[PDB]
Amino acid sequence: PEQRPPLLRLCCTQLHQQNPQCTCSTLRRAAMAVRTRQGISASSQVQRLFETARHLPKTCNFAGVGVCPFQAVP
């Protein structure tokens, strides 16, 4: 299928409710929330969690943002 997974589209719609210069900060907050609420601790899972969050503007075609910069994982 050429259309994206429905959940990804819902995420992109939520991201579009924010200004570009808020997107990376809020995605970092969202990643921290997932990591702690779900107890994600395995190193590769934690790294992939934060990477996925930082790439979401680009996964969503939020062209004014690109990929969010790396910040040390807690």
Minimum separation from the CB atom of position 31 to other proteins (A): 6
CA 71 – CA 35 distance, rounded (Å): 15
Asked if 65 and 24 count as a contact pair (C-beta separation under 8 A), the reply is: yes
What is the phi-psi region of residue 53: left when phi exceeds 0, alpha when psi lies from -120 to 50, beta otherwise? alpha
Residues that bind other proteins (CB under 8 A): 7-8, 10-11, 13-15, 17-19, 21-22, 25-27, 29-31, 33-35, 38, 40, 42, 44-49, 52-53, 56
Residue 41 or 63: which CB sits closer to other proteins?
41
Residue 3 or 21: which CB sits closer to other proteins?
21
